[PDB]
Design a protein around this ligand. Structure first.
Ligand SMILES: CS(=O)(=O)NC(=O)c1sccc1SCc1ccc(Cl)c(Cl)c1
Length: 284
């Protein structure tokens, strides 16, 4: 698993695709197996106090990488279902977390403050195909207050495929910060995504909005593993292309898989990653 030179990567996509995507299948099987001889603890996620704080029972936050809330004047007020994840040539470039529940909106915005996050990437619709994916954690208009964080909507731009919301937030404790949410909104009534270019532009633009010397980028979908992982791998790999002109999708995914369970949750997503990077390379 050395990196693949960028000039041969589309060639390599051809081979993975061939014979009914046999190659993609071997690769993703390898990914799902690369936890085999690996026990990773998530005791906090499984604790009775913390259970109502998880959206899905089997989607947990690994202890070692979990984001810790500063505790409040109770022994578990430090928990949120969220993990730090690496970007390219950087550690904890991301926080990958579940879409926040009613009962965890306070924790969610607290984490945002404590971690000094300045960019949100939302990769779900609140509802999709009739099933609830995420409860709305920001104000429809003007201000809303969550715990000691007051969130104010300042600005919105709605594009074909995603929406950009510029919030201003303040800690009641005077000190204020700009936080921008990139929301990918375009979701099929049936099936799943199928052209990667719109996602590639969403990623390029959201990744570019990151400010130097800020905290990690928050990335969530519903469960916070599938599309969250897809974003992360595609972003990291454009970075790597830009810097070294090489690609290592398989190596990097194996790695961040130790940092949060089930990142990139399906083969179709694993294929989509390649399609995005293909668009980015042919596009140049
Ligand atoms: C698990 S699933 O919902 O059944 N299938 C998918 O989500 C699947 S299956 C192929 C892609 C996807 S989601 C693609 C995507 C859309 C928007 C963004 Cl911003 C990013 Cl990063 C990635």
């Amino acid at each position: 698993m050395e990196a693949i030179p960028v000039k041969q990567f589309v060639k390599h996509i051809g081979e993975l695709y061939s014979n009914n995507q046999h190659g993609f299948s071997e690769d993703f099987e390898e990914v799902q197996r690369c936890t085999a001889d690996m026990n990773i603890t998530a005791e906090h996620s499984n604790h009775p106090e913390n259970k109502h704080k998880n959206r899905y029972i089997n989607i947990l936050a690994y202890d070692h990488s979990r984001v810790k809330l500063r505790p409040l004047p109770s022994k578990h007020s430090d928990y949120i279902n969220a993990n730090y994840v690496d970007g390219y040539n950087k550690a904890k470039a991301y926080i990958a977390t579940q879409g926040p529940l009613k009962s965890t909106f306070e924790d969610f915005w607290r984490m945002i403050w404590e971690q000094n996050t300045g960019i949100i990437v939302m990769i779900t619709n609140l509802v999709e195909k009739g099933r609830r994916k995420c409860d709305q954690y920001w104000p429809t208009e003007n201000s809303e207050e969550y715990g000691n964080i007051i969130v104010t909507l300042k600005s919105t731009k709605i594009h074909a495929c995603y929406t950009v919301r510029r919030f201003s937030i303040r800690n009641t404790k005077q000190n204020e910060r700009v936080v921008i949410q990139y929301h990918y909104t375009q979701w099929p009534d049936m099936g799943v995504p199928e052209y990667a270019l719109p996602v590639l532009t969403f990623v390029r633009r959201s990744s570019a909005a990151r400010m130097p010397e800020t905290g990690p980028v928050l990335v969530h979908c519903s469960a916070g593993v599938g599309r969250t992982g897809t974003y992360i791998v595609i972003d990291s790999m454009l970075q790597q292309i830009k810097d070294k002109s090489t690609v290592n999708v398989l190596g990097f995914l194996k790695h961040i898989r130790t940092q949060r369970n089930y990142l990139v949750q399906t083969e179709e997503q694993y294929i989509f990653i390649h399609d995005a990077l293909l668009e980015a390379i042919l596009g140049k």
